[PDB]
């Protein structure tokens, strides 16, 4: 059950975020593998440089491109995806 | 020394490696 907490993308790119997150959950049990799945997926479909953090007790402060940021909860995991470069 | 320490571990290892669930 994805729960978006702070997103910047358009609704389509957000939907893609949650779909790729659901797929990564279906396939990979380890957070690193999930994050690499998401990051490589978005870096491949779009072009540039994406970064994805997956955690449970986590705060940060990052710069990011405009409409290229999401902070959400899929199931019970904290996914912070963004594009820098 | 490593062989003897592994032996000391393996002693109790076998000890409660025999004790399994029973009625």
């Amino acid at each position: 059950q994805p729960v978006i907490k702070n997103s910047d993308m358009s609704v389509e790119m957000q939907k893609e975020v949650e779909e790729v997150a659901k797929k990564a959950i279906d396939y990979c049990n380890t957070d690193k593998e999930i994050a690499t799945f998401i990051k490589d997926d978005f870096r491949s479909r779009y072009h540039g440089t994406w970064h994805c953090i997956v955690g449970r007790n986590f705060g940060s402060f990052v710069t990011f491109e405009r409409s290229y940021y999401i902070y959400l909860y899929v199931g019970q995991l904290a996914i912070l995806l963004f594009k820098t470069g | 020394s490593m062989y003897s320490t592994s032996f000391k571990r393996c002693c109790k290892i076998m000890e409660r490696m025999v004790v399994q669930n029973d009625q």
């Binding site: 059950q1 049990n29 449970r56 199931g75 019970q76 | -």
Partner: protein
């Protein structure tokens, strides 16, 4: 299969904190948070991920697939006992005295 049995279960001597959590990772009832609420949350999340790893392994290369977890009861002697009992929706955990 009722709150009467649940109260009996709480009355089971030797058990310190019971933790029932939906597979979503939600501790519904408890007796461990009754001592510290920050314990069962960490435990439920961590052990749900552990049970996912256990699913991977119960489905990896030696354990035939289509075989599910039945009960994973662990025990750290002199520390505590921690039973995991998977369900289709729930997961019964208990922190008993070893």
């Amino acid at each position: 299969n009722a709150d009467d049995q649940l109260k009996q279960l709480s009355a089971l001597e030797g058990a310190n904190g019971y933790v029932i959590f939906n597979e979503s990772g939600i501790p519904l009832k408890r007796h461990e948070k009754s001592i510290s609420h920050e314990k069962a949350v960490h435990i439920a999340a961590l052990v749900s991920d552990l049970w996912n790893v256990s699913k991977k392994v119960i489905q990896r290369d030696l354990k035939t697939p289509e075989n599910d977890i039945e009960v994973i009861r662990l025990r750290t002697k002199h520390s505590y006992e921690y039973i995991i009992t998977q369900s289709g929706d729930f997961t019964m955990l208990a922190i008993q005295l070893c």
